[PDB]
C-alpha cells in the first residue's frame, strides 16, 4: 500500500529544499506546475480516459487514493517530500533524498502539460513521460513538462545496458487509473538514506530513450 | 522522440 511521505521538521530545510527546485526549474526556463494540465492547443481533458489503454490498466484503490490526496494537500501547505534538486557534472539536475524515505512511500506525480504524442513526433524535450498508448497510436498521450511542471522531470534513470545499472533503482514509475482517468506516479522501492541520489527505470514499458551513456 | 515510459500493470 502507498504511505505517504514524511516531509522534513525543520521549517528551513523544507524551504531550502523548494529554493533548489524553484532554481532549476528556472534554469529550464518552466513554471511549478504540481498537476497535469490539459488544452484545446494540445489534448483535451477527455482524451485522458484508462479505459482506452490497450490491454487495460490497474486501478487506484479507495485507500490509495486517501494517500495520494493527504500528500497532495500536503505539497500545497508547504509540507513537500524531502528531496534535494541538486546539479551533478556527469547526470545534469538530479534529485536526492535529503531525509530518509521508506520503501513504499509515494514521492511525486509526473506533471506537466499532455498533449497527443502524433502532436510531438519532432520534439526535441528530453523529458516526455507516456501517459496513456491506445490502440489507435493518433490516441496516445504524453506529458510534456516542457513549459510547466514539478521535481518528477530531474530525477535521473538508470542504464539499461549494464548489469550493474539495475542495482542502482530505488523508485519506480507506474501508470494507475483514478476516477477513470490515467495518472503517473513515482514510488519507492526500498528503503532510501538521506544523500542518496534517486534512480528509476525510464524504459519501464516501451524503449523509447536511449540510456547506454548513462552512469 | 525520446520518450520515457511506464507500465499500466503489475503494481510496483
Ligand atoms: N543515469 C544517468 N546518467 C547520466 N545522465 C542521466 C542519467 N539519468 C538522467 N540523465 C540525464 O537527464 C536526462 C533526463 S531529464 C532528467 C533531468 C536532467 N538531468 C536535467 O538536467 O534537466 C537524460 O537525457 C540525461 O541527459
Redesign the pocket.
Known sequence: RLLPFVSSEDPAQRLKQMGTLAS?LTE?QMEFSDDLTYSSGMAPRSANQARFEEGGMQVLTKEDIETLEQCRAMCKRGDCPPLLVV??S?????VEADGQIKDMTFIAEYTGDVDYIRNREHDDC??MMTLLLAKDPSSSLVICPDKRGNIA???????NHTLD?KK?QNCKCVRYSVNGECRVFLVATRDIAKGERL?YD?NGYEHE?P?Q??? | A?R?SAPATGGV
Open positions: 532549476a529550464l546539479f551533478d556527469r547526470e545534469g539536475f538530479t528530453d523529458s522531470r530531474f530525477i535521473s534513470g538508470i542504464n545499472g542502482k534512480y525510464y530513450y540510456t551513456h548513462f552512469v | 525520446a520515457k
